[PDB]
Design a protein around this ligand. Structure first.
Ligand SMILES: CC(C)CN(C[C@@H](O)[C@H](Cc1ccccc1)NC(=O)O[C@H]1CO[C@H]2OCC[C@H]21)S(=O)(=O)c1ccc2c(c1)C(=O)O[B-]2(O)O
Ligand SMILES: [Cl-]
Ligand SMILES: [Cl-]
Ligand SMILES: [Cl-]
Ligand code: NA
Lengths: 99, 99
């Protein structure tokens, strides 16, 4: 689709069989999701947001559908204010910014 | 232009007579710029995300040139680690997300 920006670009994602709402976020390098259960091992990551740095859990090679598009990649789990789809997965779905 | 998302979508802006580099950020409702002086009245606001909140000064009716396109709107000024062009100005330059 072509998504204008008068409203927040919220989409439905599917991860671990569950539907969640998430924000398409070109200002995020990484995809960050609220606390949930994911399979496999995780590794630590420090990410720096508007308010400072936080620790999150990094899960790699996670299957995730974004607005109906299949992606497989890194998902960070931690205390984010909203689920954000960052550029690591926006690139997988072929998203560009245009003006 | 069409901007791919392999790297941060950084553009040059002009604000208050100064050139700065800023992120085109679909995940931000509003535009947030590092500390600088702007003309006119302002009021304080708290904005929050990953890592918590920061206090900013809200200036209304500020003109920015974003990658050569002029737009006017509210600009928040404070200790953000990155300059952020949010939806309030992305709409004005006709920016869309496409996939
Ligand atoms: C969290 C999101 C819903 C909202 N933000 C935009 C988001 O795009 C940030 C933009 C940003 C980019 C670099 C550094 C700091 C901030 N990205 C981000 O945190 O990305 C993380 C995930 O990947 C990592 O890569 C980049 C950092 C890491 S915000 O900045 O917190 C933000 C922007 C505007 C407003 C508010 C909060 C608010 O409350 O009112 B407001 O005036 O509307
Ligand atoms: Cl840890
Ligand atoms: Cl990835
Ligand atoms: Cl505005
Ligand atoms: Na003003």
């Amino acid at each position: 689709p072509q998504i204008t920006l008068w409203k927040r670009p919220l989409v439905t994602i599917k991860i671990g069989g569950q539907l969640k709402e998430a924000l398409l976020d070109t200002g995020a390098d990484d995809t960050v999701i609220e606390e949930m259960s994911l399979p496999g091992r995780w590794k630590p990551k420090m990410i720096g947001g508007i308010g400072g740095f936080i620790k999150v859990r990094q899960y790699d090679q996670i299957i995730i559908e974004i607005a109906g598009h299949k992606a497989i990649g890194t998902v960070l789990v931690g205390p984010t204010p909203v689920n954000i789809i960052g550029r690591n997965l926006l690139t997988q779905i072929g998203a560009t910014l245009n003006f």
